[PDB]
């Protein structure tokens with residue numbers, strides 16, 4: 126109905142809740158998101174100042190038979206900040222509180238907070254850290270319910286795994302604290318938007334063991350495709366050996382030629398060269414152009430380098446954005462990559478890429494480390510024993526080309542086939558969800574054998590399906 130907006134806006138007006146609809150003059154300014162390939166088209170946007178107003182917005186959505194959709198800082202690569210067109214979007218910006226409990230060492234952050242100010246408050250107040258995504262403007266809540274693997278996650282774990290309590294407002298306005306060990310908390314670790322509006326969240330915190338830490342580059346230049354594949358398999362072997370500490374981090378670009386990457390080291394700075402020596406020795410046997418450059422930085426200066434100048438600003442900086450389409454696969458330590466699989470990946474993606482209307486953007490992050498003690502059943506998003514996080518992407522120079530998606534999906538299909546051929550099952554990463562997958566595909570790749578349990582929790586907490594608000598929302602059984 127094309128007067129649905131009118132009934133909703135009058136419902137919200139009567140509840141004292143600031144809101145806009147597409148006849149408001151600020152509609153354009155309030156419908157902005159990071160992903161430019163998709164166009165936001167909510168039915169209305171509410172701006173609750175407190176939990177009572179969130180409850181009143183939920184009732185309004187139910188009364189007009191529309192879905193409810195939380196809007197954080199708008200970073201979703203899938204457009205989920207606004208969701209499927211026709212939602213009542215609930216803008217969470219007022220929920221910006223952050224507080225630290227120095228007795229428990231738990232940090233509490235509101236449902237609309239950004240990474241930068243949460244980290245800076247914790248660092249300035251207590252000299253402590255919480256693993257986080259590589260963008261100070263990103264929503265802490267949104268990024269944490271979708272995984273959030275960051276540079277410190279090989280030794281400190283992921284943002285999602287370090288949560289301990291989530292304060293939910295459910296579809297009927299009831300507030301509940303979901304604690305670690307419960308079904309609602311388990312479901313929120315991978316599918317949090319499907320169960321309610323998150324008002325605040327508590328997380329573990331950590332003390333860095335050294336004042337300074339290291340950012341490095343590793344470069345091997347222009348290699349043959351076979352030599353590039355050997356190099357990746359050698360990096361993998363090092364990462365699985367006794368020579369690689371969990372305080373290491375490394376991102377291997379999928380941009381070749383050239384072959385190179387960027388990494389970090391969070392152990393004792395003077396140990397760096399001995400940590401890297403076994404890796405460099407092996408890579409030198411593949412190419413003499415192997416070269417490592419490194420810098421020692423104070424803890425916070427390195428954090429600003431990783432996640433941007435917004436780390437120092439009260440809203441975490443600027444949104445930015447471009448037009449792109451993300452694909453992403455994860456693999457585990459039960460299926461280390463072969464030289465053939467590494468070559469097929471690069472041959473089909475970055476080495477074949479020949480568009481002049483898009484610019485390729487690919488990389489694979491070394492996971493591993495403390496993922497070794499995680500089981501796929503421990504959290505809704507199955508990531509036990511993850512070893513690689515692979516992202517293959519491309520951003521449009523202008524508008525996104527009509528054949529871009531089919532071109533990009535065909536690029537990496539041979540690699541997917543090769544993973545299956547060697548006996549792996551295809552897996553994904555929620556924050557890098559692939560908008561083009563069927564339900565059978567994304568449910569298998571994100572939730573594998575947790576999916577049936579996830580749907581039973583969904584019926585318990587959202588029987589009306591009010592929060593079935595994006596393409597990969599958990600359905601009712």
Ligand SMILES: *Cc1cc2c(cc1C)nc1c(=O)[nH]c(=O)nc-1n2C[C@H](O)[C@H](O)[C@H](O)COP(=O)(O)OP(=O)(O)OC[C@H]1O[C@@H](n2cnc3c(N)ncnc32)[C@H](O)[C@@H]1O
Pocket residue numbers: 159194195196197198199200201202204205206207217235236237257258259260262263264265266267268269271272273274275317318321322323324556557595
């Ligand atoms: C823009 C961006 C994203 C990003 C990144 C760097 C930048 C510049 N770096 C990342 C990284 O290093 N690692 C990673 O895993 N992801 C990274 N991202 C992606 C980002 O984490 C995800 O896109 C994330 O979903 C963004 O969340 P944010 O909250 O900022 O964005 P949103 O579009 O408005 O909302 C995303 C989804 O989460 C739900 N949500 C958000 N807040 C709530 C609350 N309070 N309650 C319930 N659900 C909530 C939204 O409904 C939507 O589904």
Ligand SMILES: *[C@@H]1O[C@H](CO)[C@@H](O[C@@H]2O[C@H](CO)[C@@H](O)[C@H](O)[C@H]2NC(C)=O)[C@H](O)[C@H]1NC(C)=O
Pocket residue numbers: 340341342418419420430
């Ligand atoms: C590690 O990160 C630092 C901080 O960003 C990099 O230092 C910058 O280096 C460029 C030139 O390479 C200068 O123009 C910047 O002014 C530097 N910034 C600071 C704060 O010093 C450093 O190059 C990185 N080290 C690597 C990649 O090995």
Ligand SMILES: *[C@@H]1O[C@H](CO)[C@@H](O)[C@H](O)[C@H]1NC(C)=O
Pocket residue numbers: 477479
């Ligand atoms: C670009 O790549 C596509 C995909 O294989 C191919 O069909 C096309 O001929 C290529 N164009 C050029 C100029 O190489």
Ligand SMILES: *[C@@H]1O[C@H](CO)[C@@H](O)[C@H](O)[C@H]1NC(C)=O
Pocket residue numbers: 295296297299585586587
């Ligand atoms: C609100 O919904 C939850 C979700 O099932 C339910 O447990 C609770 O009883 C409901 N509360 C009220 C007051 O209806």
Ligand SMILES: [Cl-]
Pocket residue numbers: 335336337338394
């Ligand atoms: Cl030091």
